[PDB]
Amino acid sequence: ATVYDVPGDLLVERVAQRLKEIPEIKPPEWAPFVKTGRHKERLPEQEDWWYYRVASILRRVYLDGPVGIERLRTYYGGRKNRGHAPEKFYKAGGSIIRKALQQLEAAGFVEKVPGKGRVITPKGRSFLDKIATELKKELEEIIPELKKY
């Protein structure tokens, strides 16, 4: 199986749950007190949003690697409610993305190509592929049309 073979949301939540056990990945000291982006209104409602964000970033690096902080910020931006003014799209803060990428590199799942961005290490590829194949094995019983893939 492969990351392409399963829905993104299920794989990312499963990957976050697995990453919870990795000692390198831990929330920063300012995680409780920080919004995910300038366009957001209030803080995340999940006490473990850090692991979900890290899993999503790792999946993005896998699929679209090499990538950089600015492009990840563009992806993680969104619409903002400016009040009486019309809504507009805005980017996201770079601190979360930078720290998550640094932690992933320390864990060994991501390696930086100079002047190009961050690509996925073979260890990270194996990690994601293992999680994806177990997820696909689970999904096969529920839906029998994926057995041929």
Binding site: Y4, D5, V6, P7, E145, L146, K148
Partner: protein, 134 residues
């Protein structure tokens, strides 16, 4: 043996390659079975259901779609897949079935966006600001 086909809709271009396989239809690297929304999945899937189970399992297709929104990409993939199936099978019965079901599956949609004009161009071509008189 491979057969190549193309489809266009709005601003979406879909290139499809049909070959003999186990019936695993993949679009942009993803299986067609886990495509969302359900409306787009049904739009893409209609030609295969029309063709039948035996042909669907006999042949496999790989599609690459660029441009447009999700509905436009689904329509382009649908057109490319229908053309690929028609050419591969080479039979006229399913061709007539396609014609009587949805004539545009093999014939693209020529509709495009009408350019905007002054007096509320941003709103659209025929949109205009309301008058006030007195």
């Amino acid at each position: 043996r491979i057969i190549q086909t193309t489809g266009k809709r709005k601003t979406a271009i879909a290139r499809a390659v049909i070959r003999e396989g186990k019936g695993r239809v993949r679009i942009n690297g993803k299986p067609v079975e886990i495509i969302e929304p359900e409306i787009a999945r049904f739009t893409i899937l209609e030609p295969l259901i029309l063709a039948g189970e035996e042909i669907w399992n006999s042949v496999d297709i790989d599609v690459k779609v660029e441009g447009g929104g999700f509905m436009g990409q689904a329509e382009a993939a649908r057109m490319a897949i229908a053309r690929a199936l028609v050419e591969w099978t080479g039979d006229m019965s399913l061709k007539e079935k396609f014609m009587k079901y949805d004539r545009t599956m093999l014939v693209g949609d020529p509709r495009r966006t009408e350019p905007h004009k002054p007096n509320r161009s941003t709103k659209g071509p025929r949109a205009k600001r309301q008058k006030s008189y007195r």
